[PDB]
């Protein structure tokens, strides 16, 4: 009832982990170097907006 | 003074092998740490733990 309700096994609000979980290994001034997880989240975000605009 | 035992002396062809001690010897007391894990880095080269 308090910590694990079946309804929460389905996601509606997706938590975004802070940079130390997905470190931008930013080498040099001009270059960056974002982590895999940053791309997957950006991939999730891109996919979300397509759907959000599409249904609206 | 003579050795009570007689030793089997003579040449044998021996090869020097590619692993020198001064190439292996490693020590660390604090140093470089990985970014994600924040633990010591790996290897002699990187002054790892």
Q: Is B4 on the interface with A (CB under 8 A)?
A: no
Nearest CA to B35 out of B20, B46, B24, B26 is that of B46
Buried/exposed code over A33-56 (b: 16+ C-beta within 10 A; e: otherwise):
eebeebeebeeeeeeeeeeeeeee
Resolution as reported, in Å: 3.9
CA A2 to chain CA centroid, Å, is 26
Query: Is residue B36 within 8 angstroms of chain A, CB to CB?
Result: yes
CA distance B22 to B42: 18
What one-character-per-residue DSSP string does A1-50 give? Answer: --S--GGGGS-SS-----GGGS-----SSS-----HHHHHHHHHHHHHHH
Chain B CB within 8 Å of residue A18 CB: no
Residue B35: list chain A partners with CB under 8 A.
23, 25
């Amino acid at each position: 009832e308090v910590f694990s309700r079946p309804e929460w096994m389905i996601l509606t609000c997706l938590p975004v982990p802070p940079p130390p979980v997905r470190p931008s290994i930013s080498f040099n001034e001009s270059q960056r170097g974002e982590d895999d997880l940053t791309f997957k989240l950006a991939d999730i975000l891109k996919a979300n907006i397509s759907l959000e605009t599409l249904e609206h | 003074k003579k050795l009570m035992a007689q030793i089997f002396f003579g040449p044998t062809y021996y090869q020097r092998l590619r692993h020198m001690v001064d190439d292996k010897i490693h020590a660390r007391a604090r140093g470089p740490m990985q970014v994600l894990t924040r633990q010591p880095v790996e290897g002699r080269s990187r002054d790892g733990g």
